[PDB]
Amino acid sequence: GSDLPPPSPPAAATIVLPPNWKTARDPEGKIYYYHVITRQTQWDPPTWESPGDDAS
């Protein structure tokens, strides 16, 4: 990443997600996000902003 090297995911990661966050994808077609403030990452859990049904 530009700000931070990619993390392995924390359980805490879900708490809050900042617009500051960056994204990266693996060679094996997986795309994920990482939080520069908190040092967190999520590959599967949706962004801070999601539809109404997801209720983020």
Side-chain angles (χ1 to χ4, degrees):
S2 319
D3 299 89
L4 291 178
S8 41
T14 180
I15 186 63
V16 195
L17 192 159
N20 297 31
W21 97 109
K22 302 296 222 171
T23 44
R25 161 205 64 181
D26 306 81
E28 294 163 83
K30 182 167 80 293
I31 177 58
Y32 61 93
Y33 334 105
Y34 47 95
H35 306 166
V36 287
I37 282 78
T38 46
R39 274 79 187 167
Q40 307 175 329
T41 168
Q42 307 186 150
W43 9 280
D44 181 85
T47 26
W48 193 67
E49 292 194 270
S50 306
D53 296 78
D54 204 286
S56 41

